[PDB]
Every structure is written in structure tokens, then in C-alpha cells.
């Protein structure tokens, strides 16, 4: 539920309503080296 300014609300867990900050996505890294190719 978009509240605004990066804050979003939801209904979760014995159950209630919570408000949190969005997560853009799962962090990932790429191994870069000047003589390697996938």
C-alpha cells in the first residue's frame, strides 16, 4: 500500500498493520577481472 515518500504499509503478522520502507531488489555483485569471461 503506497503511503508516500518511500514509505509503504501492509497487513502482516497475531495480525496487525505495519509500515516500512520499500526494498528496490536483492543486492547482487559481478566478479570482474580483465582476463575472465562467462
Amino acid at each position: 500500500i503506497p503511503i508516500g515518500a518511500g514509505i509503504c504499509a501492509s497487513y502482516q503478522t497475531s495480525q496487525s498493520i505495519i509500515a516500512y520502507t520499500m526494498s528496490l531488489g536483492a543486492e547482487n555483485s559481478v566478479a570482474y577481472s580483465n582476463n575472465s569471461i562467462a
Partner: protein, 429 residues
């Protein structure tokens, strides 16, 4: 035929969203007056329509940025080492020193575009905040930048695959139409034309004041419209006064309703006109945002063959940057340099059979003949590994007559002469 090249960086600016806004049913028309609201209650359900329209506009405004900036679902990060084979990317990667994780060009864009009047707007006119804060947009842009320099164009199609940058540029040139070797023999030169050119961008944005006009016009239009809407309510509209409390406190209950009716009709008409104008502007901004999304998807995540789409010249790559209510693309492209004149022929037949180039074109410097590429000068001897034969040479018009050196002649005669010498030696015993 050109004999040299140059690399140019072009900038492009596109708006992506306008400022969300909302209005009040009653405080604008009948501010702190009970009787005016009581009489206004009998006019139907207009401001419900106004509220629905403005809510739709705000939702669409959020969706525009959400669609444009969120084409990757995994937030990549650049490696700590910053040696990309001679290329210098220090002008676009995020700067850790600043509390806000932004690069140099993003800082310039934010400083150049500038946003008591808001306090003056007590007349039920508010501005809502956007859903995506600026830090998240900057982080999306950083993810795109870190994904497009360490994995090529692969991360836009599936699993990200690493590859050296000096090989990615070779792939890009091979895509343009010039063989990859021309990169590996000029790498130290090419970087010098890149690292310099990107620098010239930073001054240009601060050189003229009309560079950021497209982004400034949106906020200018919004502020101007709100100011006119605020200033509209000073007009009598044919009534006796523009102050609502004076009419009630100076007249009885039998004719003051006529004048307050005139005033309420005027204010309602003005509000409806404002709503219609906002609808038109929102539609225009949505069209621009769709174009920006297409540009982001095609120019950045891959390589485009559409001429004059992602920059003048043959396209090499692009880099995105954020800006207040908009996006800025930096297109790196390739342009042929000074050229030379030459004499050419369509076909060439030696043994009564015409020959045609497999890829490239025939050329002559005045006395001999060579075969070369189209976008660069690199003469080579005509060989059967370069040409293919088809039919006779009595029907093609404009053919010339010169010998063709079949590379099979090296590859076999180099042994044939030795065999003949061996036989000649064998004759004596």
C-alpha cells in the same frame, strides 16, 4: 573512403513526470463561511469528479517514474577496482564523499534546475510528495551504470555474464561494421578521445542557460497555473464585492443569494478550467515518459541500428543520469574523420570469369588494385579468399582487367616449386 575516425558524446534531456497536486471542495469557494457551503451543497457532485480526476493524475504520475526507472530487478554494484583498460569513468559513477550518493553530472543537473508562495496557498491547494524518493532513483541509475560496464548488454536478457571492457568495445565496433582489429591497434588513442570528450560535457551543461529548458518549463507551467488559480478569486464576477462575509453582513436573506450565486458560478467555472488544463498536460507528459522508457530500454540495454535514434552517427553506447522530473542520456557514438578520394570498379575478371568482393569494395591508388572495407582504409591484395566468382565477364558493365592472386597459389605453389626442384634433383641419379 575515410582514413580516420572520431568519438563524440551527445546529451539528451527528457521529462518524465509532473508535480502531483490536489484541491479542496469547499475551502476554495466558500472559505470559512457556513451559509455558502449550505447553498453550495445543492449544486450536485462536481468536486467529486474533480477529486477523482486529480487522484487519477497523481497515480499516473507515480506510475510513469516507476515504469521508466525500474527495468532491473537486481541491484548490481561496481567492483572496488577502477581500471577499465584505460577508460576513465570517474565522471559518472557515484561519489562516496558527498552525503548524497550522486556523481558530478547529477550534482550539476540538480544545481542548475531550481524549484512564501506555498505558505500563501492557504486556499485549499496542496502538493503531495512523490512515492519514489530521489535516493532510490539515484540508486537505480547507479545499478544501471554498474551493470552496463561490467557485463555488456547481457544483463538485459538473462543471467549477467562478465566480460573485459576492451573486448566489449571490440564487439561494439564489429557490430558497427568495421573489423575489431582496428580497436586493438588504436586502444591508447581511443581512450584519449573518450576521457577528454566526457570532460567537455561538464562545462557544456553550465555553459548556456537554455540547456535545461525542457525540465524547467514543467515547473514553470505548474507554478504559473497555481498562481493564476489563486489570483482568480479577487474578481467580483458582476457581484457587489469579492469578500463573501461583507455580502451577508450588509444584506438580508432575500437578494444576497443572487450575488453569492454569481460568485460561486464564476469560481466553479475557473476550477473546472484548471482541471481540464491539468488533464491535457498530464497526457502530454505521459507520452514523453513512454518515449523516454523506450529510449532507456533500447539505447542503453543494447545496441541500436535505427539511424539517428540514439545520437547522430553510428551508435556505440549510452549512459543514463537522473534530474529533477526528468532523465538525461549521454550517447557515445562514432563518426568518420577526414577522407581520401579513390578510383573504383564494380568487378574484376582475369581468367574469363568475373570476381566480386566477399565483403568490402575494390579500390585503386593509381597503378595497382586493392580490396578494402567500407568505413576504414586498409588495403589488401586481391585474393580468392577475398573474392567469389560467378558467371562470365561479358555481361557486367564497367568491369576492368587485372590479375587476381589466388591465395591457393601461395598455399600450394610454395610446395609445388619444392616438389619440382626435388624431381629435378632426382633426375640426375
Amino acid at each position: 573512403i575515410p582514413t580516420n575516425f572520431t568519438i563524440s558524446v551527445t546529451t539528451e534531456i527528457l521529462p518524465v513526470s509532473m508535480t502531483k497536486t490536489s484541491v479542496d471542495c469547499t475551502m476554495y469557494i466558500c472559505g470559512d463561511s457556513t451559509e455558502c457551503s449550505n447553498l453550495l451543497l445543492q449544486y450536485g457532485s462536481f468536486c467529486t469528479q474533480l477529486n477523482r480526476a486529480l487522484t487519477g493524475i497523481a497515480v499516473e504520475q507515480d506510475k510513469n517514474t516507476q515504469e521508466v526507472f525500474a527495468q532491473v530487478k537486481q541491484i548490481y554494484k561496481t567492483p572496488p577496482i577502477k581500471y577499465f583498460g584505460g577508460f576513465n569513468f570517474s565522471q559518472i559513477l557515484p561519489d562516496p564523499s558527498k552525503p548524497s550518493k550522486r556523481s558530478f553530472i547529477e550534482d550539476l543537473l540538480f544545481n542548475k534546475v531550481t524549484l512564501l508562495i506555498c505558505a500563501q496557498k492557504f486556499k485549499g491547494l496542496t502538493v503531495l510528495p512523490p512515492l519514489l524518493t530521489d535516493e532510490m532513483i539515484a540508486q537505480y541509475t547507479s545499478a544501471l551504470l554498474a551493470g552496463t560496464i561490467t557485463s555488456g548488454w547481457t544483463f538485459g536478457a538473462g543471467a549477467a555474464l562478465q566480460i573485459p571492457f576492451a573486448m566489449q568495445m571490440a564487439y561494439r565496433f564489429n557490430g558497427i561494421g568495421v573489423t575489431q582489429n582496428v580497436l586493438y591497434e588504436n586502444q591508447k588513442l581511443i581512450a584519449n578521445q573518450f576521457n577528454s570528450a566526457i570532460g567537455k560535457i561538464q562545462d557544456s551543461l553550465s555553459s548556456t542557460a537554455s540547456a535545461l529548458g525542457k525540465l524547467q518549463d514543467v515547473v514553470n507551467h505548474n507554478a504559473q497555473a497555481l498562481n493564476t488559480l489563486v489570483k482568480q478569486l479577487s474578481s467580483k464576477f458582476g457581484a457587489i464585492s469579492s469578500v463573501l462575509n461583507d455580502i451577508f453582513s450588509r444584506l438580508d436573506k432575500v437578494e444576497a443569494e443572487v450575488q453569492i450565486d454569481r460568485l460561486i458560478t464564476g469560481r466553479l467555472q475557473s476550477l473546472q478550467t484548471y482541471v481540464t488544463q491539468q488533464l491535457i498536460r498530464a497526457a502530454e507528459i505521459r507520452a514523453s515518459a513512454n518515449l523516454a522508457a523506450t529510449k532507456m530500454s533500447e539505447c542503453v540495454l543494447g545496441q541500436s541500428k535505427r539511424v539517428d535514434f540514439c545520437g547522430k552517427g553510428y551508435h556505440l553506447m549510452s549512459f543514463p543520469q537522473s534530474a529533477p522530473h526528468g532523465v538525461v542520456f549521454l550517447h557515445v557514438t562514432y563518426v568518420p574523420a577526414q577522407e581520401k578520394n579513390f578510383t573504383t570498379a564494380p568487378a574484376i575478371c582475369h581468367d574469363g570469369k568475373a570476381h566480386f568482393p566477399r565483403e568490402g569494395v575494390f579500390v585503386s591508388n593509381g597503378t595497382h588494385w586493392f580490396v578494402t572495407q567500407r568505413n576504414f582504409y586498409e588495403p589488401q591484395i586481391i585474393t580468392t579468399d577475398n573474392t567469389f566468382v560467378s558467371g562470365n565477364c561479358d555481361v557486367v558493365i564497367g568491369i576492368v582487367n587485372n590479375t587476381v592472386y589466388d591465395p591457393l597459389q601461395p598455399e600450394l605453389d610454395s610446395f609445388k616449386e619444392e616438389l619440382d626442384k626435388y624431381f629435378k634433383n632426382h633426375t640426375s641419379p
